[PDB]
Amino acid sequence: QEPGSGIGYPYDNNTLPYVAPGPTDSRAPCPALNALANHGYIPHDGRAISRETLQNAFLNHMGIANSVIELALTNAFVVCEYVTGSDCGDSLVNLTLLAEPHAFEHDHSFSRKDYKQGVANSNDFIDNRNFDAETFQTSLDVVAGKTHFDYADMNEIRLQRESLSNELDFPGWFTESKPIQNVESGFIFALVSDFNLPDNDENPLVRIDWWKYWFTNESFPYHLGWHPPSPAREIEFVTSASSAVLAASVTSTPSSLPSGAIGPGAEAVPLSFASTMTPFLLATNAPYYAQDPTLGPND
Numbered sequence: 195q196e197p198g199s200g201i202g203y204p205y206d207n208n209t210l211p212y213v214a215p216g217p218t219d220s221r222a223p224c225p226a227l228n229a230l231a232n233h234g235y236i237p238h239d240g241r242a243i244s245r246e247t248l249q250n251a252f253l254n255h256m257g258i259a260n261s262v263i264e265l266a267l268t269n270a271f272v273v274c275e276y277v278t279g280s281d282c283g284d285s286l287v288n289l290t291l292l293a294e295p296h297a298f299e300h301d302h303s304f305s306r307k308d309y310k311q312g313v314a315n316s317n318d319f320i321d322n323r324n325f326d327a328e329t330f331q332t333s334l335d336v337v338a339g340k341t342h343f344d345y346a347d348m349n350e351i352r353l354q355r356e357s358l359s360n361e362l363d364f365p366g367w368f369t370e371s372k373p374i375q376n377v378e379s380g381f382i383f384a385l386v387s388d389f390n391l392p393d394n395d396e397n398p399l400v401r402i403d404w405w406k407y408w409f410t411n412e413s414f415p416y417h418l419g420w421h422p423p424s425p426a427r428e429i430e431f432v433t434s435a436s437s438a439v440l441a442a443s444v445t446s447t448p449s450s451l452p453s454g455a456i457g458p459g460a461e462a463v464p465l466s467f468a469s470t471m472t473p474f475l476l477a478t479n480a481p482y483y484a485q486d487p488t489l490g491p492n493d
């Protein structure tokens with residue numbers, strides 16, 4: 195928001211306006227990174243980003259401590275090298291390369307289509323980076339009619355997404371990725387769980403309207419009563435939530451579910467790519483931005 199508006203006060207006293215990305219700007223398959231870039235907390239064009247810029251943007255404007263993004267940082271730079279062919283040092287070339295399939299970017303996302311989702315030819319691939327309203331809708335349907343949801347509901351959502359992707363993706367493409375996806379499940383509870391509730395730290399409930407605003411608009415739900423969590427969330431909360439989701443009892447099992455989908459998952463670890471392996475081509479679609487309605491500077 196405009197600095198003088200005082201919208202983020204007293205949680206964020208140094209805000210910047212929202213500015214929609216242009217045809218030449220670089221965006222990622224991450225709703226958190228895109229929101230930061232749209233506000234200029236990280237380069238608005240999504241290029242040449244240092245670890246320290248990432249750390250400060252997250253901590254100061256999203257209430258996310260350094261421990262939370264430690265592994266994400268490592269994996270971002272590992273992928274940069276794999277895609278560009280050379281070490282990226284401390285300057286992430288761009289956000290777009292983060293959408294390199296079967297790496298950090300994984301199948302069965304909550305709001306993006308898979309790289310080879312519903313393609314007639316093996317050589318075809320599609321936009322697995324930009325926000326897809328229809329895909330997000332398949333996530334929202336699971337909790338239709340509710341205002342909040344818990345760990346059990348989230349487990350149902352990720353199960354529905356895995357079933358759909360396993361069925362729609364070109365034969366042989368689908369690859370389950372529970373460790374990374376559920377850290378992201380934890381990210382969601384860390385950022386948009388309802389801190390107004392008495393036992394938010396032990397039994398966090400996600401506010402659906404906050405979640406919708408963030409994902410769809412790629413900006414912050416201040417107009418809805420949201421504010422960065424204070425104190426800043428630490429990695430402890432995220433991995434615990436991740437674990438609680440996969441441990442939640444399932445009351446509805448979808449069909450065509452990949453083997454071992456139900457049950458605990460392994461902890462996320464840094465990625466590694468064989469030097470013999472060539473990267474997949476990146477989708478070249480222009481950056482997505484909210485159009486119904488378009489956002490103003492304070493949205």
Ligand code: HEM
Binds near residue numbers: 258266301
């Ligand atoms: C520098 C740190 C980060 C990097 C490099 C990063 C990278 C990525 C990438 C590559 C994806 C995978 C896309 C997919 O296949 O679903 C993604 C997804 C996502 N990220 Fe981030 N991210 C970071 C931090 C965060 C944080 C701290 C949050 C929020 C508190 C966040 C929330 C999400 C969510 C919820 C998704 C999943 C969207 C979906 O499945 O539709 N990210 N991020």
Ligand SMILES: *[C@@H]1O[C@H](CO)[C@@H](O[C@@H]2O[C@H](CO)[C@@H](O)[C@H](O)[C@H]2NC(C)=O)[C@H](O)[C@H]1NC(C)=O
Binds near residue numbers: 411417484
């Ligand atoms: C995306 O952001 C816009 C702007 O903040 C949201 O539109 C506001 O929504 C509430 C409830 O629908 C209205 O009372 C406001 O007056 C709306 N403002 C405008 C300019 O229309 C929109 O709801 C957000 N989208 C999602 C999915 O959360």
Ligand SMILES: *[C@@H]1O[C@H](CO)[C@@H](O[C@@H]2O[C@H](CO)[C@@H](O)[C@H](O)[C@H]2NC(C)=O)[C@H](O)[C@H]1NC(C)=O
Binds near residue numbers: 221278289291476
């Ligand atoms: C982000 O960086 C990647 C890696 O440099 C860019 O992708 C390459 O772009 C060149 C020129 O368009 C192509 O010859 C390569 O084949 C691309 N690599 C891959 C793996 O697809 C990408 O264009 C950059 N994107 C943005 C928006 O800046």
Ligand SMILES: *[C@@H]1O[C@H](CO)[C@@H](O)[C@H](O)[C@H]1NC(C)=O
Binds near residue numbers: 203204
């Ligand atoms: C925002 O400003 C108020 C008053 O100056 C102060 O008490 C508060 O701690 C500030 N918030 C942050 C995150 O610095």
Ligand SMILES: *[C@H]1O[C@H](CO)[C@@H](O)[C@H](O)[C@@H]1O
Binds near residue numbers: 461462
């Ligand atoms: C989230 O974190 C838990 C605990 O590390 C994992 O078991 C899960 O697979 C996901 O990575």
Ligand SMILES: *[C@H]1O[C@H](CO)[C@@H](O)[C@H](O)[C@@H]1O
Binds near residue numbers: 434461
């Ligand atoms: C979640 O899990 C991680 C590792 O899996 C722990 O470091 C953290 O304390 C929390 O228990």
Ligand SMILES: *[C@H]1O[C@H](CO)[C@@H](O)[C@H](O)[C@@H]1O
Binds near residue numbers: 397430438
């Ligand atoms: C780990 O931490 C989360 C969030 O604080 C709890 O909900 C979970 O019960 C476990 O204690």
Ligand SMILES: *[C@H]1O[C@H](CO)[C@@H](O)[C@H](O)[C@@H]1O
Binds near residue numbers: 433434435437438441
């Ligand atoms: C990982 O952590 C969560 C929260 O402590 C547990 O509920 C789960 O059973 C697993 O041990």
Ligand SMILES: *[C@H]1O[C@H](CO)[C@@H](O)[C@H](O)[C@@H]1O
Binds near residue numbers: 443444445
């Ligand atoms: C785990 O437990 C739930 C209730 O908590 C059952 O309804 C479900 O079928 C599963 O066995």
Ligand SMILES: *[C@H]1O[C@H](CO)[C@@H](O)[C@H](O)[C@@H]1O
Binds near residue numbers: 347350445
């Ligand atoms: C059993 O309960 C879960 C949440 O606890 C629902 O998401 C599911 O649809 C079923 O009714």
Ligand SMILES: *[C@H]1O[C@H](CO)[C@@H](O)[C@H](O)[C@@H]1O
Binds near residue numbers: 350447448
């Ligand atoms: C029960 O609910 C789950 C999640 O909503 C579905 O995927 C399943 O098909 C059944 O209808």
Ligand SMILES: *[C@H]1O[C@H](CO)[C@@H](O)[C@H](O)[C@@H]1O
Binds near residue numbers: 443444445447448
């Ligand atoms: C649907 O079916 C699976 C596997 O049979 C169960 O684990 C789940 O609890 C639900 O009843």
Ligand SMILES: [Mn+2]
Binds near residue numbers: 303306
């Ligand atoms: Mn994906």
